[PDB]
Structures are given as C-alpha cells and as structure tokens.
Design a protein around this ligand. Structure first.
Ligand SMILES: *[C@@H]1O[C@H](CO)[C@@H](O[C@@H]2O[C@H](CO)[C@@H](O[C@@H]3O[C@H](CO)[C@@H](O)[C@H](O)[C@@H]3O)[C@H](O)[C@H]2NC(C)=O)[C@H](O)[C@H]1NC(C)=O
Lengths: 214, 223, 196
C-alpha cells in the first residue's frame, strides 16, 4: 500500500506571495498524482492531474510538478480566493489514497470589527427562552474576546461563540456570541451590553440595548 | 456539462446500515467509459476513497473498507449508490460521489480507471440515536450600516442551509457554523449587512432548509 | 492482399486544422493493427472501450480515421468527457466512444522559423459541439450586445485563431499530429477484419 505524506500541515502567507505544497509518495507512482482544492463547505475541485497537467478553467498561477515519489503544487501569486485545503491523491493501480491535507490560511493586515447586537425577538420570547445575539463583523486576526454583562453582572457559562472561516474576498473573520437564559431570568434586568475587546480597537467597544425598546 | 446529486438519510443509528445514492444528470451512466465512485470525509478530517464502479458492474473497493460496503448501479434510473454495513460512530461523514476521467487501455493492453474528474456536492450523514427535529426560526430585527438576520435555534442533525431573498441577496451574507448547545441540538445564526437606506423599502426574508426533518421556514425581518 | 489504407492516414503529408478535421472512411479491407501498437514512434496511444490486443479478433463495419493537428498540451483534451477549447469547440468525443487516439510529435514537420500560422483552431462558439460535430463557420462571434454583421471590432471577434508553431517553442506548444480511429459496427455486415 502506497501512503502519501503531505507537508506542511498548515500555512500562513500573504497575498501576492508564492507558496508550494509538497507530496511525498512512499513508493514510485510514475506521474499518477492529482491535486485537489477544497474551499470551505464545498466539494473538492480537481486542480492538477498526471502530476503537472492543469485542468481547464483553473487559474494559470496553479502549477504542479514532480515524478516518481516527490511532487509539488505551487500557487505562483497567492489570492484571497485561494484560501482552501489542498489534497494530493495517487491514482496508480486501483488503491487510492489521499494526503492528510494542507490548509492554506491568508495572512492579512490588522482589521477592526463592525459590532452589532440583536435583541431577542417577540416570537422567541413566547416559547420561554430568550437569546441575545452579539455580532463582530469583518475583522482580523481571528482572536477576540466577547464578554457579556447584564447590568454589569459579568456572565459566565451562559454563552457560546462561533467563528466563521476566512472570507473568500477579503480574508477576514466574523464571530457570533449568543447568550441564552430563560424568559424568567431575561425580564428581571434592564441593561444588556456585550463588550468586544480586539487588537484592531483603541479601547474595547461595547454595544448594548435596554429591554423592550429602551 | 455533467452534474451529480447526492441523496441520503439525515441520520442512521449505530450498527445499522447506511445507504446513499447519486443521481447523474446531463450524461448517461449506460455504456459510458467512466468509473463512478464514492469518497467520504468525516467532519474536520481528510478524504477517504470507498469504491468505484463501471456501468457493467465491475467494482473496485478500498481494502480497508471492503466487506462493510458494496456499491451498485441502476443503469436504468441513471444512478449509483453505496450501502455501508454495521455503522460505527466513526463513519459519521460527508459522502461524495464522483465521475472518474475516461478509462482507457494503453498500447500494451493495461487498463487505467484514472482520477476523480467531477464531484457532487456531498450529503452529510450523522450516526446517532436522536430526535430528528426541525428548527425554530426567530427573526433578528435591525451611517448606512445595517445588520439583520435569522436565528435558527435547536435542530438536529446537521445540516441546515440558509439563503437570502431566495438567492437574490448573496453579497455581504455571513452564515455561521452550528454550535452544539448542551441540549443536544444545534444552534446557528445567519446575518447580512445591508445599506441602512434599505430597512424599509427592500424585502429581507431568510430561506431556511433542514433536510433531515423536511422543514422549510421563511421568516421576514422588519425593524 | 487488400490492406487497409492506414499508411494513407498516418503517413500523409498534409494534416487538417483541428476545427476543420478530416474524416477518412475505412471499409472492405483487412487491417493489421499490430503495425500501430507495436511501435514507440507515438507519444500518446490510448484506446477507449476496446483493448488494442483484442483488436485483431474483432470485425467492424466501418473504421473512421479522423486526423488533425493541435499543440501538445491539448492532446489530453482528445478523450471522452474532457473540457477546454479543443474538447468543446473543435473535436468532441462521445461519452461511450469505442476507438483509439494516437498522437505523435511533429515539430520537425509543422514548425517553420517565424511560425507556422497555417494551423487554426476555433476559439469562440456560443455552444459546445456535439460529439463528432465539425464546425467550420467563420461567422463573427458576438461577445457583447453589439450585433457584429461580418465586421470585427470591439466585442466582435473572428472565431478562429492561429497556432503559430515555432521550432523553438517548449514541448507544450509544439505541433502534434493526432489520428482518432472509431470502431463502429452498425446494422451492416462486418467488413473490416484482421488477419489469419
Ligand atoms: C509510415 O512510413 C514509415 C517509413 O516507411 C513506416 O515505418 C517503417 O515501417 C516498416 C514496415 O512496417 C518497417 O520495416 C521493418 O524493418 C525492420 C528492420 O528489421 C523490422 O523491425 C520489421 O520486421 C519491418 O519489416 C520499418 O522499421 C519502419 N521504420 C520506422 C523508423 O519505424 C511506417 O510503418 C508507416 N506508417 C504506417 C502507419 O504504415
């Protein structure tokens, strides 16, 4: 059995840079190697086949070379759309094996979050659960701290958060922190304020509302 | 153009049998010189080949998975399909079907089935013992900088799919990853930035689709 | 006896341009396929749907020999299901093709210093070709909203471009000659067999 080792595992690089990913095959596989790209949440896309042939409609910056047991994929000039995971696959014989995958992240200039907060809707409060949404839109780097305060009572354990993937177009992240409590606990207070602390900010920007159009 | 669609059960349960099929469009499996194949990719991990099959029926399997699976073709409906036996927790994945390049013989007579030329969109299959459950859809009401959204709370299993104005609005959208609340159901948020001059004039409706429970919900969002 | 005119095809002096490829019908003879595959004078040799070894055991009603010239980086488009300018706009093979595709480099025949600009290829079309279509229309292609009325201009391109084969080019851009043998047996009697 042929086993493929791909390096590196991950990869940061800036736009316009040149990057090359490596695939090592444990046995000779002639030129029977293909390279696949997988942008977040999509199917793999064939980039290169027979080690070096470029599939139609694939950008001209993508190039592959190699034969025998060492191969490379090379993005000549990085683009922000080129954020993806890259997999190599040998198709020698009829035992098909992939590489572990190289995840390509884009390094970007520091950026600060547009912040929004959304009150728990009318229709949801009828069900007995209230959820307050705090949104951090389009920032960089990914690191950010969201702190909830309900009348300056610092919340702990009543929220989870979720980071998006780097954007195909501007290579920025977005983040959602949502605080859930019972409808009982929700109306017991006035001032809801999520505190967003981020590197791209002078001092932490906090956005808030007061319950019921207050 | 050749395109490939996946159909599958939202979830199964441990040690059961998993079954997905792939309906080929814009080209016929009959008499075609391609092997058709299945590839799975568990969440966050890499790709694994399962097997591929010709129109004739001839197959090739991944040795590590042969005996738990058998794939077959219904040349008459233009579909092929995978059946995976005695499911473990491990086999939770997105299952992908694919069309190989045209298979050929070389000067000496040696046969090559080639690489995966085209891919389907993939169907996620969760191994579980859980309540299939549609989501509640509550709207998230709103210098020119407006944010509005949907909250799709407490559904199971993955995935849900969100569009805005039935695919009209796509620019500036951000659909977030699902968070698994300790309740055992997934929670998610979909948002979009719009010019604040749009809050009254243009209609903003999020189109939600939770395939495993056959749910569809449209929630309009107004100030 | 009466052998099949394969020399006529492979050893011809003139080759057509890919967009206007040339089809030779072959029937009522006996063909030695071993002369083809027992040869490394060829750079590509892929048969689809039958094995060349099993060729001498079969009989066909027609063999069609389509032949044209493209640059080497495009020979990989002369296959079922491929995509690209050659596959979609010049020579399409069908999903169920039964035949062979044989190609060899001809830099020493089809390159001239300063460029052989006599080989053309279709570059624009409003739709893909059907399998075995052959489209030689020179009608100006409307790439915009302006009707072009046989006058080139802005958004108005003449649909054939020249190859310009120079003997100095990298191999990806050198001229290759291609022959594509189709092994059809219709509702006729088998008339193209192999030897004893
Ligand atoms: C196109 O023309 C060329 C040249 O005339 C042909 O190549 C030559 O073909 C002949 C007959 O097939 C070969 O003759 C051979 O002589 C050698 C000497 O020992 C022997 O190996 C064989 O038993 C045969 O009698 C000749 O070697 C060969 N030359 C080269 C350089 O390949 C070619 O066959 C023609 N193409 C077609 C499609 O007929």
């Amino acid at each position: 059995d042929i086993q493929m080792t791909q390096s590196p595992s991950t990869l940061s690089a800036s736009v316009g840079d040149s990057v090359t990913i490596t695939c090592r095959a444990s046995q000779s596989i002639s030129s029977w190697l293909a390279w696949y790209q997988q942008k977040p949440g999509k199917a793999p896309k064939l980039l290169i086949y027979k080690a070096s042939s470029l599939e139609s409609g694939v950008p001209s910056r993508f190039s592959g070379s190699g034969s025998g047991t060492e191969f490379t994929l090379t993005i000549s000039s990085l683009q922000p759309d080129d954020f993806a995971t890259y997999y190599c696959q040998q198709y020698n014989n009829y035992r098909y094996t992939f590489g572990q995958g190289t995840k390509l992240e884009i390094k970007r200039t520091v950026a600060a979050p547009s912040v929004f907060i959304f009150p728990p809707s009318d229709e949801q409060l009828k069900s007995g659960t209230a959820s307050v949404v705090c949104l951090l839109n389009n920032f960089y780097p990914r690191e950010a701290k969201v702190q909830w305060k309900v009348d300056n009572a610092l919340q702990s354990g009543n929220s989870q958060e979720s980071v998006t993937e780097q954007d195909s177009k501007d290579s920025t992240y977005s983040l959602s922190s949502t605080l859930t409590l019972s409808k009982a606990d929700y109306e017991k207070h006035k001032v809801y304020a999520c505190e967003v602390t981020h590197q791209g900010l002078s001092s932490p920007v906090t956005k808030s509302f007061n319950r019921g159009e207050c | 153009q050749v395109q490939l669609q996946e159909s599958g059960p939202g979830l199964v349960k441990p040690s059961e049998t998993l079954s997905v099929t792939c309906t080929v469009s814009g080209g016929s499996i009959s008499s075609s010189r391609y092997y058709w194949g299945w590839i799975r990719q568990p969440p966050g991990k890499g790709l694994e080949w399962i097997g591929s099959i010709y129109y004739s029926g001839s197959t090739y399997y991944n040795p590590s998975l042969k005996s738990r699976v058998t794939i077959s073709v219904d040349t008459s409906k233009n579909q092929f399909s995978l059946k995976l036996s005695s499911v473990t927790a491990a086999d939770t994945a997105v299952y992908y079907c694919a069309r190989h390049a045209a298979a050929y013989y070389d000067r000496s007579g040696y046969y090559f089935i080639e690489y995966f030329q085209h891919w389907g969109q993939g169907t996620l299959v969760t191994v579980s013992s859980a309540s299939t459950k549609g989501p509640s859809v509550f709207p998230l009401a709103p210098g020119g900088t407006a944010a509005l959204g949907c909250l799709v709370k407490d559904y199971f299993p993955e995935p849900v799919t969100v569009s805005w104005n039935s695919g009209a609005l796509t620019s500036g959208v951000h659909t977030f990853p699902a968070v698994l609340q300790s309740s055992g159901l997934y929670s998610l948020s979909s948002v979009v930035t719009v010019p604040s001059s749009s809050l009254g004039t243009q209609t903003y409706i999020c189109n939600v689709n939770h395939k495993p429970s056959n749910t569809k919900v449209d929630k309009r969002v107004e100030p | 006896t009466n052998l099949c005119p394969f020399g006529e095809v492979f050893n011809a002096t003139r080759f057509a341009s890919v967009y206007a490829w040339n089809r030779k019908r072959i029937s009522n003879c006996v063909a030695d396929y071993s002369v083809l595959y027992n040869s490394a004078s060829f750079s590509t040799f892929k048969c689809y749907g039958v094995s060349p070894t099993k060729l001498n055991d079969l009989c066909f009603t027609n063999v069609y020999a389509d032949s044209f010239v493209i640059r080497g980086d495009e020979v990989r488009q002369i296959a079922p299901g491929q995509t690209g300018k050659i596959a979609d706009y010049n020579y399409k093979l069908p999903d169920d093709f039964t035949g062979c595709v044989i190609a060899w480099n001809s830099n020493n025949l089809d390159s001239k210093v300063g460029g052989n600009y006599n080989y053309l290829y279709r570059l624009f079309r409003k739709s893909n070709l059907k399998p075995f279509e052959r489209d030689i229309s020179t009608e100006i292609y409307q790439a915009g909203s302006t009707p072009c009325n046989g006058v080139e201009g802005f958004n108005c391109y003449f649909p054939l471009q020249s190859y310009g084969f120079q003997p100095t080019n990298g191999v990806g851009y050198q001229p290759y000659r291609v022959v594509v043998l189709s092994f059809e047996l219709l509702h006729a009697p088998a008339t193209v067999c192999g030897p004893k």
